[PDB]
Design a protein that fits this description.
Layout (H helix, E strand, L loop, with lengths): L4 H10 L10 H12 L6 E3 L5 E3 L4 E2 L29 H11 L9 H6 L15
Helix pairs in contact: 1-2
Bound molecules: chloride ion (2 copies) and sodium ion (2 copies).
Subunit structure: Monomer.
GO biological process, one term: defense response to bacterium
EC number: 3.2.1.17
């Protein structure tokens, strides 16, 4: 499913991401736009052989099991395929674990390079929330 901007903001708000660990909703919407273009089906291979999955591009090297990333962890205790669902619950719940691990949203490269230090509230402008 390809979300609209305001539709995704509303879904993330209901799943508790607004101001989670101090990150306002626009940060999460901005990260999703540049990680996946709001597409829950997005996948992308990494040089080390791991793969990133879903709307927030969660990496099989640490967070989910895809059966083909040797020596990797599964810290969210989920198959990576669950992160491609049109229901974002699993991606949100795993993202809460990632953002709480000490490095905040710097774990998402696109957030650090394209969202951090910008007017991220623009990403929720106009939306009925
Ligand atoms: Cl959803
Ligand atoms: Cl932080
Ligand atoms: Na915001
Ligand atoms: Na893994």
């Amino acid at each position: 499913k390809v979300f609209g901007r305001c539709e995704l903001a509303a879904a993330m708000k209901r799943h508790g991401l607004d101001n989670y660990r101090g990150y306002s909703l626009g940060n999460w919407v901005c990260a999703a736009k540049f990680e996946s273009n709001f597409n829950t089906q997005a996948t992308n291979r990494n040089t080390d052989g791991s793969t990133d999955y879903g709307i927030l591009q969660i990496n099989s090297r640490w967070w989910c099991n895809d059966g083909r990333t040797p020596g990797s962890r599964n810290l969210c205790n989920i198959p990576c395929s669950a992160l491609l669902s049109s229901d974002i619950t699993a991606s949100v719940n795993c993202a809460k674990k990632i953002v709480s691990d000490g490095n905040g949203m710097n774990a998402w490269v696109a957030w650090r390079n394209r969202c951090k230090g910008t007017d991220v509230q623009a990403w929720i402008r106009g939306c009925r929330l």
